[PDB]
Known about the structure:
The complex is a heterotetramer.
Chain A (H helix, E strand, L loop, with lengths): L11 E2 L2
Chain B lengths: L11 E8 L5 E6 L5 E3 L7 E8 L3 E6 L7 E2 L16 E6 L5 H12 L12 H8 L4 H13 L3
Parallel strand pairs in B: 1-7
Antiparallel strand pairs in B: 1-4, 2-3, 2-5, 6-7
Chain D lengths: L1 E5 L5 E5 H4 L3 H6 L5 E3 L5 H17 L16 H11 L2
Parallel strand pairs in D: 1-3
Antiparallel strand pairs in D: 1-2
Helix pairs in contact in D: 3-4
Amino acid sequence: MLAPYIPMDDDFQLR
Amino acid sequence: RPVLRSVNSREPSQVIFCNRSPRVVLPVWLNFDGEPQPYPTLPPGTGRRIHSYRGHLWLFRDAGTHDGLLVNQTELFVPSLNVDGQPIFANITLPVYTLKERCLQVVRSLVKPENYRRLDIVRSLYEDLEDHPNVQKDLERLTQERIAHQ
Amino acid sequence: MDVFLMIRRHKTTIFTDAKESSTVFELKRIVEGILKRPPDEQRLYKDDQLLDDGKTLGECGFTSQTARPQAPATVGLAFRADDTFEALCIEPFSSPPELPDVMKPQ
Amino acid sequence: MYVKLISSDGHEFIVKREHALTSGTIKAMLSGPNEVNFREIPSHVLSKVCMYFTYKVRYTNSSTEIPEFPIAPEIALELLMAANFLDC
């Protein structure tokens, strides 16, 4: 059973 | 409950959580048993790439108060298969809170619970202050609305 | 590109919206329908600046980014008299009591 | 078209009828086949209530980013009592 995960990545500002 | 729950599709779906609210947002994943699981929060005005799966269920709340928030104008977000490799956007926004609910939020943010009864306000509001937002109660509510609408 | 306003005179305030592209004269028409005084008997202000009839609200400095629903921009209003000058006067709202101790950062 | 709400200190607030109906209390009052007195509510509170009517009408049924409705700590209790009273 595969759960969600977050890739090591820089967040970005919403313009 | 088995009604509101993620399905173990094992089919990857690329998603982008976009916080378009002034709150610190807490993404909540409903696991395979319909139990809410917290995920890393998002600061106001920030976005983040997420590796999710087709058929999984997500909801969003204010991280510190659990005040309700909307995702794509509704309560729940369900990732779909990516088309042309395009990530699915999950735009998180504040809902239009009733004036009464908004005042309750502010009072709660300023007063310790053990001091609610010390406020010079009408009796009935004490109970309202104490009835703070709860994800479990929301899921039950959504499930009734869910079932009871057919 | 709507701007949300509060048109105030003495103890009266009108909440209304208008387009950044609409004119001051058109705003006076709105006021005329409510307070029954023609545009040529009205003086509208943004702070202490008298707004010219032919300019748009945008050209006058009003922007949807500041004149929002939950925090409308104030437009001053004064009426003309045939032999005297009224002078812009906006009566202040009341003030709340002291913030209760239980709500203070304690 | 427009309704006039009167506060405790005599200030008069004129708002569009449709906006005033945001208040369940006012909606029921004017539902039958205008000036309304709310002389128990001070102007520093009634003014915010009217701003809430504008906010509610503008952002309801909208997909635009919704801003926070601001409430200063010192008017929160009185505003809460008015919101409860006005049903909005």
